[PDB]
Every structure is written in structure tokens, then in C-alpha cells.
Amino acid sequence: HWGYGKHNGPEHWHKDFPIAKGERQSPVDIDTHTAKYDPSLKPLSVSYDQATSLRILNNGHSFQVTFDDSQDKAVLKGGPLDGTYRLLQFHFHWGSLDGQGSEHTVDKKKYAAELHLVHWNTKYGDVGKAVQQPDGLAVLGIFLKVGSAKPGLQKVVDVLDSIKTEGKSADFTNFDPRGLLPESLDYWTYPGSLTTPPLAECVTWIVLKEPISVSSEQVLKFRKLNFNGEGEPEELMVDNWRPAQPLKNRQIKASFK
Numbered sequence: 644h645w646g647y648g649k650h651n652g653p654e655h656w657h658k659d660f661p662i663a664k665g666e667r668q669s670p671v672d673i674d675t676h677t678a679k680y681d682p683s684l685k686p687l688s689v690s691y692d693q694a695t696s697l698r699i700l701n702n703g704h705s706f707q708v709t710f711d712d713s714q715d716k717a718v719l720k721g722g723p724l725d726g727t728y729r730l731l732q733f734h735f736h737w738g739s740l741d742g743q744g745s746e747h748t749v750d751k752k753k754y755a756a757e758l759h760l761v762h763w764n765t766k767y768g769d770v771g772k773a774v775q776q777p778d779g780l781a782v783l784g785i786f787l788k789v790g791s792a793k794p795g796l797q798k799v800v801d802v803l804d805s806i807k808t809e810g811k812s813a814d815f816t817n818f819d820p821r822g823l824l825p826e827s828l829d830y831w832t833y834p835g836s837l838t839t840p841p842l843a844e845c846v847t848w849i850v851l852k853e854p855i856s857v858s859s860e861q862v863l864k865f866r867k868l869n870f871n872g873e874g875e876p877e878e879l880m881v882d883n884w885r886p887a888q889p890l891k892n893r894q895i896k897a898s899f900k
């Protein structure tokens with residue numbers, strides 16, 4: 644199956660998922676001098692006060708915290724979006740060393756990791772139908788750099804030892820994703836895709852300008868996860884990022900001057 648290794652990594656994905664060479668693939672490099680300020684872009688609306696986390700799970704390509712999305716309890720609206728998008732899950736991509744790990748880049752700069760908060764457009768009823776629409780998902784992307792610790796991440800990192808291998812999950816209730824957001828909600832936006840198979844071209848990307856800082860100890864715990872399942876040859880879950888893809892006929896818009 645697909646992965647991030649030598650013989651199944653991102654350069655191979657197009658054989659099973661030909662849209663990998665498509666016209667609106669993600670991630671991309673954000674050239675800050677080429678992105679144009681759009682004064683018509685509204686402030687983002689992050690409404691997470693009633694978010695209900697359910698589970699945390701190692702899925703073989705990342706770890707994910709899942710939320711109750713059967714009601715409008717944690718929604719994203721405004722910004723470049725038309726309508727209400729419900730939070731389904733968040734997950735991260737990270738590197739083997741601090742100078743790589745993000746999927747999006749900024750003037751070719753790679754960050755140590757990237758957080759993706761995944762939401763789907765309520766006008767399509769369920770996430771599976773949303774992934775078949777060009778405006779079906781909205782992913783909020785947040786860069787992580789290594790420095791001071793992010794206190795609101797510690798509850799996540801402390802439970803990772805209980806989901807070390809592919810397939811494992813645990814109860815993860817009462818987690819507040821507001822503790823992972825930076826001060827500013829200034830952002831770049833462009834039309835793109837899922838960054839893992841099936842690479843569906845269904846995402847409005849909203850990438851925050853301001854990174855969050857996490858400690859070397861916190862990211863070290865990400866790097867102790869395993870791609871493999873319990874009992875198979877241990878392969879550390881590191882470098883689970885797709886590189887930047889061709890921008891093609893797309894403009895990146897900025898919400899800020």
C-alpha cells in the first residue's frame with residue numbers, strides 16, 4: 644500500500660491515484676511576495692467552544708484526534724468560505740529532524756511540523772460526499788517550530804505511547820483544540836487537494852501565517868510513533884509529509900498586508 648518509504652512514497656502515488664498529477668494538488672510553496680492581499684477576504688470564524696473530542700488513533704500514516712461531527716458543535720466559517728464547515732479531526736505531519744516536516748512551505752522554508760484541522764461543508768451532509776465536491780472540505784493549516792513548549796499540546800503527546808502502532812486507538816474526550824491556535828488568524832488561502840491518498844481535489848486551504856512553538860521534547864514524542872503495526876519490524880513514523888506540488892493555474896491570496 645501507499646506510504647512514505649523508498650518504494651511506496653509520494654513519487655509513486657500517481658500509479659494508484661492519477662490525480663496526483665492534477666491541476667490543483669497540495670501542498671504548495673507559498674511565495675509570500677507573489678501572494679496578493681485580498682481586502683475582500685473576511686476574518687476567519689473559528690467556533691470551537693462546544694467541540695467534543697472522541698478518540699485518538701494511529702492510522703498508519705499519522706495520528707488523529709476525532710470529533711463528534713453529527714451537529715454544529717465546532718465549526719469554521721467566514722474567511723474565503725461560503726457556508727458552515729464542521730470539524731471532523733485533526734492530525735499532524737512531521738520530520739525526522741527539526742528542519743523538515745511541514746507540507747506547505749513559506750518562501751521554500753520548511754517547518755518542523757504542520758497541524759491540519761479538517762472540516763467538511765454541511766451542505767453535503769457527510770464527509771464522504773463532501774470529498775467528491777470542489778468546495779467540500781476546508782483544512783486549517785498551522786506550522787510548528789521548535790522552541791518553547793505549547794502547553795495545550797501536552798495532553799496529546801502524553802497519550803501517544805498508548806497508540807504506538809498502526810491500528811491502536813484510545814479514548815480522548817474533553818480535549819480543547821483552541822489550545823493549539825496561534826495569536827493571529829491572518830492566513831493565506833488557495834484551492835487545493837488532500838495531501839494523502841486519494842488526493843481528492845476538494846479542499847479550500849487556509850494556512851495560518853503565525854506558527855505555534857512546541858518544545859523539542861514534544862516533537863520527540865511524535866517521532867517515537869511507528870508506521871508498522873504491533874509485531875512487525877519497527878519503522879519510526881517520521882517524515883510523513885508530501886513535498887510541495889506545482890502551483891499551475893492558481894493564485895494564493897493573503898488576508899493581511
Ligand SMILES: CC(C)NC[C@@H](O)COc1ccc(C(=O)NCCc2ccc(S(N)(=O)=O)cc2)cc1
Pocket residue numbers: 759761770771772774782836837838839840
Ligand atoms: C460509503 C462507502 C462506500 N465509503 C464511501 C465514503 O463515505 C467513505 O467514508 C469516508 C470517506 C472519506 C473520509 C475522509 O475524512 N476523507 C478525507 C481524508 C483526509 C483528510 C485530510 C487530509 S489533509 N492531510 O489534506 O489535511 C487528507 C485526507 C471519511 C469517511
Ligand SMILES: [Zn+2]
Pocket residue numbers: 734735736759838
Ligand atoms: Zn494532513
